[PDB]
Amino acid sequence: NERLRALEDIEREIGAILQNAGTVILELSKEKRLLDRQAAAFTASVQHVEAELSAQIRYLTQVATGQPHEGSSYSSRKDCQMALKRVDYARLKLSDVARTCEQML
C-alpha cells in the first residue's frame, strides 16, 4: 500500500494552488486580509510538487526486459477453487441424503 498511498498523495497534491495563485498580487486593493496566500502557495507548493515528482521518477526501475511483478501464475489456487467445488458437491450430496431422510419419515 506504500506505492498506492504515494500515488494517492501525488494525485491529491497534483492540483496545487500554484495554478490559482495568479490572483495574489491584486490583493492589495485596500491600502498603499488574505495576503499570506502570495507567500506559501506562490512557488513553494510548485517546488515541493516538482521535488516529489522528481523523487518518484528516480525509482528502482525494476521492469527491464520481460514480465516482472508476477505472483499468481501458478498452482493450487485453481485447486483451492476445486476444493470449494468439492464442498459444493458435498452440500448437494447432503441435501440429497436429507431429502431421502425426509421421505423416510
Binding site: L84, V87, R91, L94, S95, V97, A98, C101, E102, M104
Partner: peptide, 30 residues
C-alpha cells in the same frame, strides 16, 4: 421394538446430519 429402534436411530442420524450441514452452510465466506 426393532422398528421403533430403527426409526429412532434414523431420526437421530437425520438430525445429526442436518445440524452438521447447517453450521457449515457458508464456511467459504468469499
Amino acid at each position: 421394538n426393532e422398528l421403533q429402534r430403527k426409526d429412532a436411530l434414523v431420526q437421530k442420524h437425520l438430525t445429526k446430519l442436518r445440524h452438521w450441514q447447517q453450521v457449515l452452510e457458508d464456511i467459504n465466506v468469499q
